[PDB]
Design a protein around this ligand. Structure first.
Ligand SMILES: CC(=O)N[C@@](C)(c1ccc(F)cc1)c1cnc(N2CCN(c3ncnn4cc(-c5cnn(C)c5)cc34)CC2)nc1
Length: 297
């Protein structure tokens, strides 16, 4: 074939990103798991020659298999291809010469939104009080970031309040692109792996058939909205993940409206959870909907 879709993970690493690893000073661990960790760090001279800035640095454990090493490089290449957006945790640099690959991203000083909502829950106002206006703004910003990803033919596959971070100026940023994929060629992705999965955030077709699409990211956005307007409650309260859970989801059980969700935001949630993926809204449509809500506020 003389025309093809360019696979961003096949492109060369662009050395414009390269930063000297001796100019990083690691601080505390921000997240940790089986394969590696993300740490806070000081980067000396990263943007301005004479200034230090705080960054986040993603790194694998020395024992990481080659499956994990290439996945980290692939994530670096996807972030390089996507480009910059206000509502994602942006790539700032990488250390790839010789030693372990380090991926340097923006640091979000307020941490993840799930923990933020839970801390602010008891003083929420339906001073520095969380308000409904904050929640509408966060819903809008995450929709904008996801619309951006979809516009680049990318899916995230783990959208959840725990993977939205908060930084200065009430700006929310989507983080953790380890499972993000460009799906330009086939319009879906079939997960063949065997890791633990975020079942309560997954579309039914992802649970039952391992298929991930633009539309399954939209399902997870609906679950995120329920977390958001519930001020950080866990989804499907009182329902463990077991045979009954899957049966109920398949038969059409859905969560009810959070107490603080405006009717038009619960309306979005319900459409995000349509059993038919074709009936779910796109992120582009969601952005326009929330825009209209904010302007009428
Ligand atoms: C399955 C798995 O192993 N995942 C691994 C463990 C993984 C790791 C390495 C690897 F190579 C492959 C996978 C994983 C992947 N991402 C992450 N994070 C996403 C990025 N993040 C942040 N970014 C930017 N700023 N920021 C600020 C805070 C913060 C916290 N408190 N306060 C006050 C601020 C947090 C972050 C937080 C965690 N944490 C672990």
């Amino acid at each position: 074939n003389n025309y093809s879709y360019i696979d961003p993970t096949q492109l060369p690493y662009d050395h414009k990103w390269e930063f000297p690893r001796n100019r990083l000073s690691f601080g505390k661990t921000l997240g940790a798991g089986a394969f590696g960790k993300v740490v806070e760090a000081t980067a000396q001279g990263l943007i301005k020659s004479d200034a230090a800035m705080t960054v986040a640095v993603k790194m694998l454990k020395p024992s990481a298999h080659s499956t994990e090493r290439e996945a980290l490089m692939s994530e670096l290449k996807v972030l390089s291809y996507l480009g910059n957006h206000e509502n994602i945790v942006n790539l700032l640099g990488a250390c790839t010469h010789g030693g372990p690959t380090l991926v340097i991203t923006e640091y979000c000083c307020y941490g993840d939104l799930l923990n933020f909502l839970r801390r602010k829950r008891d003083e929420f106002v339906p001073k520095d009080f969380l308000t409904l206006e904050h929640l509408l703004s966060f819903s809008y910003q995450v929709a904008k970031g996801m619309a951006f990803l979809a516009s680049k033919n990318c899916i995230h596959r783990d959208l959840a309040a725990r993977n939205i971070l908060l930084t200065h100026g009430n700006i929310t940023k989507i983080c953790d692109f380890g499972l993000a994929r460009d799906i330009k060629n086939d319009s879906n992705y079939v997960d063949k792996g065997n890791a633990r999965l975020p079942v309560k955030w997954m579309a039914p077709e992802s649970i039952f058939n391992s298929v991930y699409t633009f539309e399954s990211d939209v399902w997870s956005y609906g679950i995120f909205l329920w977390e958001l307007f519930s001020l950080g409650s866990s989804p499907y309260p009182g329902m463990p993940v077991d045979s009954k859970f899957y049966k109920m989801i398949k038969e059409g059980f859905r969560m009810s409206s959070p107490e603080y969700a405006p009717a038009e935001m619960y309306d979005i949630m319900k459409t995000c959870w349509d059993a038919d993926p074709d009936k779910r809204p796109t992120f582009k449509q969601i952005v326009q909907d929330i825009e209209k809500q904010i302007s009428e506020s």
